[PDB]
Design a protein around this nucleic acid. Sequence first.
RNA 1: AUUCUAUGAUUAGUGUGAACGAAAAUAGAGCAGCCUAUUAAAAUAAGUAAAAUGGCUUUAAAGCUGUUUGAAUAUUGUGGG
RNA 2: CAGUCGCGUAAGCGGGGCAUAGGAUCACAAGAUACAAAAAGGAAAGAUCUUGGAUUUUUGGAAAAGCUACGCUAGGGAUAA
Lengths: 48, 112, 62
Amino acid sequence: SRIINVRLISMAMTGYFYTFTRPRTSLPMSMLKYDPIVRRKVLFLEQK
Amino acid sequence: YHRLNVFVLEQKPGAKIDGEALKKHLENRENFSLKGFREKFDLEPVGFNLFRSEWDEGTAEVMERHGIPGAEVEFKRQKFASLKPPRKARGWEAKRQKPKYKSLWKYVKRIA
Amino acid sequence: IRKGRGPSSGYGKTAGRGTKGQKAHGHVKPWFQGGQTPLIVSHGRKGFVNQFAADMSELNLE
RNA sequence: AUUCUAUGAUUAGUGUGAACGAAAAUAGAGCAGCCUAUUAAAAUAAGUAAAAUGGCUUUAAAGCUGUUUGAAUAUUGUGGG
RNA sequence: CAGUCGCGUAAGCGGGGCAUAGGAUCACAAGAUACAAAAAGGAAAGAUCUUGGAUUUUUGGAAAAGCUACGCUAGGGAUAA
Ligand SMILES: [K+]
Ligand SMILES: [Mg+2]
Ligand SMILES: [Mg+2]
Ligand SMILES: [Mg+2]
Ligand SMILES: [Mg+2]
Ligand SMILES: [Mg+2]
Ligand SMILES: [Mg+2]
Ligand SMILES: [Mg+2]
Ligand SMILES: [Mg+2]
Ligand SMILES: [Mg+2]
Ligand SMILES: [Mg+2]
Ligand SMILES: [Mg+2]
Ligand SMILES: [Mg+2]
Ligand SMILES: [Mg+2]
Ligand SMILES: [Mg+2]
Protein backbone atom coordinates (compact mmCIF):
# COMPACT_ATOMS: atom_id res chain seq x y z
CA SER A 1 0.00 0.00 0.00
CA ARG A 2 3.00 2.27 0.55
CA ILE A 3 3.81 2.14 -3.19
CA ILE A 4 1.44 2.71 -6.10
CA ASN A 5 1.83 2.16 -9.84
CA VAL A 6 0.96 5.31 -11.77
CA ARG A 7 0.49 5.82 -15.51
CA LEU A 8 2.13 8.74 -17.31
CA ILE A 9 0.02 9.68 -20.33
CA SER A 10 1.41 11.36 -23.44
CA MET A 11 0.19 14.93 -23.87
CA ALA A 12 0.36 14.48 -27.65
CA MET A 13 -2.97 12.61 -27.31
CA THR A 14 -1.51 9.60 -29.12
CA GLY A 15 -2.55 7.15 -26.39
CA TYR A 16 0.97 6.07 -25.45
CA PHE A 17 1.85 5.80 -21.77
CA TYR A 18 4.61 4.89 -19.35
CA THR A 19 4.21 3.17 -15.98
CA PHE A 20 6.36 3.90 -12.93
CA THR A 21 6.15 3.36 -9.18
CA ARG A 22 6.28 6.15 -6.60
CA PRO A 23 5.24 6.51 -2.94
CA ARG A 24 1.71 7.64 -2.14
CA THR A 25 3.06 10.54 -0.04
CA SER A 26 4.74 12.12 -3.05
CA LEU A 27 3.72 14.62 -5.71
CA PRO A 28 2.48 13.21 -9.04
CA MET A 29 5.12 12.42 -11.64
CA SER A 30 5.74 14.54 -14.73
CA MET A 31 8.55 13.85 -17.18
CA LEU A 32 9.75 14.48 -20.73
CA LYS A 33 9.70 11.12 -22.53
CA TYR A 34 9.87 9.75 -26.06
CA ASP A 35 6.62 8.98 -27.87
CA PRO A 36 7.06 6.22 -30.50
CA ILE A 37 3.79 7.12 -32.25
CA VAL A 38 4.90 10.64 -33.21
CA ARG A 39 8.59 9.68 -32.86
CA ARG A 40 9.46 12.73 -30.77
CA LYS A 41 10.02 13.65 -27.13
CA VAL A 42 6.86 15.14 -25.63
CA LEU A 43 5.49 15.87 -22.16
CA PHE A 44 4.05 12.97 -20.16
CA LEU A 45 1.74 13.60 -17.20
CA GLU A 46 0.25 11.28 -14.61
CA GLN A 47 -3.19 9.94 -15.47
CA LYS A 48 -5.21 10.91 -12.40
CA TYR B 1 35.82 8.53 -40.02
CA HIS B 2 39.31 9.19 -41.36
CA ARG B 3 41.92 11.17 -39.42
CA LEU B 4 43.86 13.75 -41.45
CA ASN B 5 46.98 14.33 -39.36
CA VAL B 6 48.76 17.59 -40.22
CA PHE B 7 52.41 17.38 -39.16
CA VAL B 8 54.97 20.19 -39.18
CA LEU B 9 58.57 18.99 -38.89
CA GLU B 10 61.79 20.95 -38.37
CA GLN B 11 64.89 20.45 -40.50
CA LYS B 12 68.31 20.70 -38.90
CA PRO B 13 70.42 23.80 -39.61
CA GLY B 14 71.68 23.86 -43.18
CA ALA B 15 69.82 20.67 -44.17
CA LYS B 16 67.94 21.45 -47.39
CA ILE B 17 66.05 18.44 -48.72
CA ASP B 18 66.50 17.86 -52.45
CA GLY B 19 63.43 18.49 -54.57
CA GLU B 20 63.93 15.25 -56.49
CA ALA B 21 64.84 13.05 -53.52
CA LEU B 22 61.60 14.27 -51.94
CA LYS B 23 59.49 13.37 -54.98
CA LYS B 24 61.16 9.96 -55.27
CA HIS B 25 60.14 8.95 -51.74
CA LEU B 26 56.51 8.99 -52.94
CA GLU B 27 57.11 7.28 -56.31
CA ASN B 28 56.56 3.68 -55.16
CA ARG B 29 55.03 4.17 -51.70
CA GLU B 30 51.39 3.26 -51.06
CA ASN B 31 51.61 3.07 -47.24
CA PHE B 32 53.30 6.30 -46.20
CA SER B 33 55.05 5.97 -42.83
CA LEU B 34 55.93 9.20 -41.04
CA LYS B 35 58.28 7.12 -38.89
CA GLY B 36 60.42 6.14 -41.88
CA PHE B 37 60.07 9.49 -43.63
CA ARG B 38 61.35 11.18 -40.47
CA GLU B 39 64.49 9.12 -39.86
CA LYS B 40 65.53 9.14 -43.53
CA PHE B 41 65.60 12.94 -43.82
CA ASP B 42 66.46 13.46 -40.12
CA LEU B 43 63.42 15.55 -39.24
CA GLU B 44 61.85 16.52 -35.93
CA PRO B 45 58.06 16.86 -35.45
CA VAL B 46 57.24 20.16 -33.75
CA GLY B 47 53.73 21.21 -34.79
CA PHE B 48 50.47 19.31 -35.17
CA ASN B 49 46.78 19.73 -35.88
CA LEU B 50 43.94 17.40 -36.83
CA PHE B 51 40.64 17.20 -38.68
CA ARG B 52 38.41 14.27 -39.61
CA SER B 53 36.45 13.43 -42.75
CA GLU B 54 33.68 10.92 -43.49
CA TRP B 55 31.30 10.14 -46.34
CA ASP B 56 28.94 13.04 -47.02
CA GLU B 57 26.52 14.14 -49.73
CA GLY B 58 29.35 15.93 -51.53
CA THR B 59 31.91 13.13 -51.39
CA ALA B 60 30.69 11.60 -54.66
CA GLU B 61 31.06 14.71 -56.83
CA VAL B 62 34.39 15.70 -55.25
CA MET B 63 35.90 12.42 -56.42
CA GLU B 64 34.60 13.08 -59.94
CA ARG B 65 36.18 16.53 -60.31
CA HIS B 66 39.61 15.24 -59.26
CA GLY B 67 39.18 11.79 -60.80
CA ILE B 68 39.58 9.83 -57.56
CA PRO B 69 38.67 6.12 -57.77
CA GLY B 70 36.65 4.15 -55.25
CA ALA B 71 33.44 6.19 -55.02
CA GLU B 72 31.50 3.18 -56.37
CA VAL B 73 32.30 1.05 -53.32
CA GLU B 74 30.50 0.61 -50.00
CA PHE B 75 31.74 -1.05 -46.82
CA LYS B 76 29.53 -3.31 -44.70
CA ARG B 77 30.42 -4.53 -41.22
CA GLN B 78 31.85 -8.04 -41.25
CA LYS B 79 29.47 -10.54 -39.66
CA PHE B 80 30.65 -13.25 -37.25
CA ALA B 81 28.06 -16.01 -37.24
CA SER B 82 27.64 -18.39 -34.32
CA LEU B 83 30.44 -20.94 -33.98
CA LYS B 84 28.12 -23.56 -32.48
CA PRO B 85 27.09 -26.41 -34.82
CA PRO B 86 23.38 -27.12 -35.36
CA ARG B 87 21.69 -29.43 -32.86
CA LYS B 88 18.31 -31.11 -32.43
CA ALA B 89 15.64 -29.15 -30.58
CA ARG B 90 14.91 -30.48 -27.09
CA GLY B 91 11.69 -30.59 -25.11
CA TRP B 92 8.29 -32.26 -24.99
CA GLU B 93 6.81 -29.79 -27.47
CA ALA B 94 9.88 -29.77 -29.74
CA LYS B 95 10.04 -33.55 -30.23
CA ARG B 96 6.39 -33.66 -31.33
CA GLN B 97 6.50 -31.11 -34.16
CA LYS B 98 6.29 -33.67 -37.00
CA PRO B 99 3.20 -35.23 -38.62
CA LYS B 100 3.62 -38.33 -36.44
CA TYR B 101 2.01 -36.58 -33.45
CA LYS B 102 -0.73 -34.91 -35.48
CA SER B 103 -3.24 -35.86 -32.78
CA LEU B 104 -1.15 -33.82 -30.30
CA TRP B 105 -0.65 -30.71 -32.44
CA LYS B 106 -3.16 -28.95 -30.17
CA TYR B 107 -0.31 -28.78 -27.62
CA VAL B 108 2.67 -28.23 -29.94
CA LYS B 109 1.54 -25.58 -32.44
CA ARG B 110 0.84 -21.85 -32.28
CA ILE B 111 2.53 -21.56 -28.89
CA ALA B 112 2.91 -17.99 -27.65
CA ILE C 1 8.42 -59.03 -34.47
CA ARG C 2 6.23 -61.43 -32.48
CA LYS C 3 6.81 -60.49 -28.85
CA GLY C 4 6.61 -62.85 -25.89
CA ARG C 5 7.67 -65.97 -27.82
CA GLY C 6 10.87 -67.10 -26.12
CA PRO C 7 14.17 -65.69 -24.88
CA SER C 8 16.31 -66.27 -27.97
CA SER C 9 13.96 -64.16 -30.10
CA GLY C 10 15.14 -61.08 -28.20
CA TYR C 11 11.61 -60.00 -27.25
CA GLY C 12 10.51 -62.63 -24.71
CA LYS C 13 9.08 -62.33 -21.21
CA THR C 14 8.85 -58.53 -21.36
CA ALA C 15 8.17 -57.56 -25.01
CA GLY C 16 10.49 -54.57 -24.65
CA ARG C 17 8.64 -52.94 -21.74
CA GLY C 18 11.10 -53.11 -18.84
CA THR C 19 10.21 -54.18 -15.28
CA LYS C 20 6.92 -53.44 -13.51
CA GLY C 21 6.23 -49.78 -14.22
CA GLN C 22 3.18 -47.80 -15.23
CA LYS C 23 4.40 -48.26 -18.81
CA ALA C 24 4.34 -52.04 -18.23
CA HIS C 25 1.10 -52.45 -16.27
CA GLY C 26 -1.11 -49.86 -17.94
CA HIS C 27 -0.87 -46.83 -20.22
CA VAL C 28 0.32 -43.23 -19.86
CA LYS C 29 -1.77 -40.45 -21.36
CA PRO C 30 -0.01 -38.93 -24.40
CA TRP C 31 -0.45 -35.32 -23.25
CA PHE C 32 1.06 -36.13 -19.84
CA GLN C 33 4.44 -34.63 -18.90
CA GLY C 34 4.62 -35.85 -15.30
CA GLY C 35 2.76 -32.87 -13.83
CA GLN C 36 4.79 -29.99 -15.25
CA THR C 37 2.48 -27.54 -16.98
CA PRO C 38 2.88 -27.69 -20.78
CA LEU C 39 4.07 -24.65 -22.70
CA ILE C 40 0.66 -24.25 -24.36
CA VAL C 41 -0.61 -23.36 -20.87
CA SER C 42 2.30 -21.39 -19.42
CA HIS C 43 2.47 -19.36 -22.66
CA GLY C 44 -1.01 -19.78 -24.13
CA ARG C 45 -2.10 -20.26 -27.72
CA LYS C 46 -1.06 -17.37 -29.98
CA GLY C 47 -3.31 -15.81 -32.58
CA PHE C 48 -6.42 -17.02 -34.33
CA VAL C 49 -7.24 -19.04 -37.44
CA ASN C 50 -9.01 -17.05 -40.15
CA GLN C 51 -12.18 -18.97 -41.07
CA PHE C 52 -13.33 -16.41 -43.66
CA ALA C 53 -10.21 -16.05 -45.83
CA ALA C 54 -10.54 -17.28 -49.40
CA ASP C 55 -8.42 -20.21 -50.56
CA MET C 56 -6.91 -19.16 -53.90
CA SER C 57 -5.26 -21.45 -56.43
CA GLU C 58 -1.86 -19.92 -57.18
CA LEU C 59 -0.80 -19.77 -60.83
CA ASN C 60 2.57 -18.40 -61.94
CA LEU C 61 3.51 -17.04 -65.36
CA GLU C 62 6.43 -19.49 -65.37
C1' A D 1 -40.07 -33.86 -47.50
C1' U D 2 -38.70 -38.08 -44.12
C1' U D 3 -35.48 -42.44 -43.10
C1' C D 4 -30.59 -45.53 -43.32
C1' U D 5 -24.92 -45.69 -44.50
C1' A D 6 -20.18 -43.13 -45.62
C1' U D 7 -17.44 -38.64 -46.39
C1' G D 8 -17.25 -33.73 -44.86
C1' A D 9 -14.98 -34.08 -39.28
C1' U D 10 -9.40 -36.07 -33.97
C1' U D 11 -13.41 -29.62 -38.56
C1' A D 12 -16.27 -24.90 -37.30
C1' G D 13 -17.21 -24.51 -32.29
C1' U D 14 -17.59 -25.36 -26.85
C1' G D 15 -14.68 -26.29 -22.37
C1' U D 16 -9.82 -23.77 -17.28
C1' G D 17 -8.79 -28.78 -18.50
C1' A D 18 -9.96 -33.93 -19.57
C1' A D 19 -12.73 -34.19 -23.52
C1' C D 20 -17.32 -33.20 -26.16
C1' G D 21 -18.81 -32.02 -31.09
C1' A D 22 -22.38 -29.98 -35.79
C1' A D 23 -24.41 -28.16 -40.50
C1' A D 24 -24.07 -26.93 -45.69
C1' A D 25 -22.49 -30.12 -49.41
C1' U D 26 -21.09 -34.95 -51.69
C1' A D 27 -21.84 -40.29 -52.69
C1' G D 28 -24.84 -44.53 -52.25
C1' A D 29 -29.70 -47.31 -50.51
C1' G D 30 -34.73 -45.89 -51.60
C1' C D 31 -37.64 -42.22 -54.02
C1' A D 32 -44.10 -39.97 -53.92
C1' G D 33 -46.54 -36.87 -53.45
C1' C D 34 -50.84 -34.45 -51.19
C1' C D 35 -55.85 -31.96 -48.69
C1' U D 36 -60.95 -34.94 -53.86
C1' A D 37 -55.13 -36.49 -48.21
C1' U D 38 -57.43 -43.58 -51.98
C1' U D 39 -60.40 -43.31 -46.50
C1' A D 40 -62.28 -40.14 -45.39
C1' A D 41 -59.09 -34.54 -41.59
C1' A D 42 -58.68 -27.34 -42.09
C1' A D 43 -63.90 -22.82 -42.92
C1' U D 44 -55.64 -21.85 -42.76
C1' A D 45 -55.34 -21.87 -36.61
C1' A D 46 -54.46 -16.43 -29.76
C1' G D 47 -53.50 -17.39 -23.99
C1' U D 48 -50.66 -18.92 -29.59
C1' A D 49 -45.94 -16.21 -31.34
C1' A D 50 -43.05 -13.55 -27.97
C1' A D 51 -41.11 -11.27 -23.24
C1' A D 52 -39.29 -11.37 -17.95
C1' U D 53 -37.90 -15.12 -14.41
C1' G D 54 -36.55 -20.50 -12.81
C1' G D 55 -34.50 -24.77 -15.67
C1' C D 56 -33.36 -28.19 -20.04
C1' U D 57 -30.84 -28.21 -24.57
C1' U D 58 -27.02 -25.29 -26.47
C1' U D 59 -22.03 -21.73 -29.05
C1' A D 60 -25.06 -16.26 -26.75
C1' A D 61 -29.21 -18.19 -31.90
C1' A D 62 -32.98 -21.72 -32.78
C1' G D 63 -35.77 -25.57 -30.15
C1' C D 64 -38.52 -27.69 -24.93
C1' U D 65 -40.63 -25.80 -20.51
C1' G D 66 -43.05 -24.20 -14.68
C1' U D 67 -44.55 -19.14 -12.92
C1' U D 68 -46.17 -14.07 -14.14
C1' U D 69 -47.52 -11.27 -18.61
C1' G D 70 -48.80 -11.01 -23.70
C1' A D 71 -48.84 -9.49 -30.67
C1' A D 72 -49.72 -8.79 -35.96
C1' U D 73 -52.77 -9.99 -40.95
C1' A D 74 -49.55 -11.55 -46.90
C1' U D 75 -44.35 -9.55 -51.85
C1' U D 76 -49.40 -3.30 -52.54
C1' G D 77 -43.57 -6.35 -47.71
C1' U D 78 -48.19 -9.03 -42.45
C1' G D 79 -45.48 -12.82 -39.62
C1' G D 80 -40.98 -16.51 -38.60
C1' G D 81 -35.78 -17.41 -39.72
C1' C E 1 20.80 -0.82 -37.17
C1' A E 2 16.86 2.76 -37.25
C1' G E 3 14.26 6.60 -34.50
C1' U E 4 15.40 11.21 -31.07
C1' C E 5 16.85 13.18 -26.41
C1' G E 6 20.46 14.43 -22.34
C1' C E 7 25.43 15.66 -20.65
C1' G E 8 30.39 16.93 -22.63
C1' U E 9 35.83 21.63 -25.37
C1' A E 10 36.46 16.79 -27.23
C1' A E 11 36.97 11.59 -27.48
C1' G E 12 32.64 9.72 -26.38
C1' C E 13 28.93 7.82 -22.43
C1' G E 14 23.74 6.70 -21.54
C1' G E 15 18.28 0.75 -23.22
C1' G E 16 18.31 2.56 -14.30
C1' G E 17 21.09 1.37 -9.40
C1' C E 18 29.15 -1.92 -7.51
C1' A E 19 27.72 -7.16 -8.19
C1' U E 20 24.93 -11.48 -6.31
C1' A E 21 17.98 -12.18 -2.91
C1' G E 22 10.00 -10.25 -6.63
C1' G E 23 6.01 -16.60 -10.22
C1' A E 24 3.40 -18.00 -15.67
C1' U E 25 -1.20 -19.11 -18.09
C1' C E 26 -6.35 -18.15 -17.61
C1' A E 27 -9.92 -14.59 -16.25
C1' C E 28 -10.51 -9.29 -15.35
C1' A E 29 -9.21 -3.88 -16.15
C1' A E 30 -6.92 0.32 -18.86
C1' G E 31 -4.54 2.04 -23.65
C1' A E 32 -3.06 1.31 -28.77
C1' U E 33 -3.13 -1.79 -33.80
C1' A E 34 -7.09 -1.85 -38.51
C1' C E 35 -6.31 -7.87 -38.73
C1' A E 36 -11.11 -10.87 -39.37
C1' A E 37 -16.55 -9.45 -38.96
C1' A E 38 -21.07 -16.62 -39.92
C1' A E 39 -26.58 -13.07 -45.95
C1' A E 40 -25.13 -7.68 -46.35
C1' G E 41 -23.99 -2.51 -43.66
C1' G E 42 -22.56 -1.98 -38.44
C1' A E 43 -21.74 -4.20 -33.85
C1' A E 44 -20.91 -7.92 -30.33
C1' A E 45 -17.57 -11.54 -29.03
C1' G E 46 -12.32 -12.49 -30.82
C1' A E 47 -6.70 -11.58 -32.61
C1' U E 48 -1.84 -8.69 -32.16
C1' C E 49 1.23 -4.96 -29.04
C1' U E 50 1.82 -2.11 -24.18
C1' U E 51 0.33 -2.07 -19.05
C1' G E 52 -1.84 -3.12 -14.17
C1' G E 53 -3.91 -5.90 -9.61
C1' A E 54 -1.22 -12.61 -6.58
C1' U E 55 2.06 -15.69 1.44
C1' U E 56 -1.39 -18.63 -7.07
C1' U E 57 4.17 -19.44 -0.19
C1' U E 58 2.72 -27.47 -1.37
C1' U E 59 5.99 -20.40 -4.65
C1' G E 60 6.26 -25.06 -13.05
C1' G E 61 0.77 -22.40 -9.95
C1' A E 62 -6.20 -27.94 -6.26
C1' A E 63 -11.19 -23.76 -3.41
C1' A E 64 -10.36 -29.09 1.11
C1' A E 65 -11.07 -31.43 8.73
C1' G E 66 -11.05 -35.99 11.69
C1' C E 67 -12.10 -41.39 13.91
C1' U E 68 -12.03 -46.78 13.15
C1' A E 69 -9.70 -51.70 18.73
C1' C E 70 -16.15 -53.38 13.65
C1' G E 71 -12.91 -52.28 9.61
C1' C E 72 -11.97 -54.00 3.87
C1' U E 73 -8.84 -54.61 -0.91
C1' A E 74 -4.23 -54.31 -3.58
C1' G E 75 0.98 -54.31 -2.26
C1' G E 76 5.83 -53.70 0.58
C1' G E 77 9.01 -56.26 3.46
C1' A E 78 11.65 -51.00 -1.00
C1' U E 79 10.64 -48.44 6.17
C1' A E 80 8.98 -50.77 12.15
C1' A E 81 7.57 -54.58 17.18
K1 LIG F 1 -33.71 -13.66 -33.36
MG1 LIG G 1 17.44 -58.96 -24.40
MG1 LIG H 1 10.60 -50.82 -25.76
MG1 LIG I 1 9.98 -51.85 -30.32
MG1 LIG J 1 6.98 -59.18 -13.83
MG1 LIG K 1 9.75 -48.37 -16.74
MG1 LIG L 1 -11.23 -26.19 -32.18
MG1 LIG M 1 -50.75 -20.56 -40.82
MG1 LIG N 1 -42.50 -20.28 -26.87
MG1 LIG O 1 -33.75 -18.94 -27.35
MG1 LIG P 1 -39.68 -18.88 -32.92
MG1 LIG Q 1 -22.41 -9.49 -41.09
MG1 LIG R 1 6.70 -26.85 -7.10
MG1 LIG S 1 13.03 -23.52 -10.91
MG1 LIG T 1 -12.26 -51.43 23.11
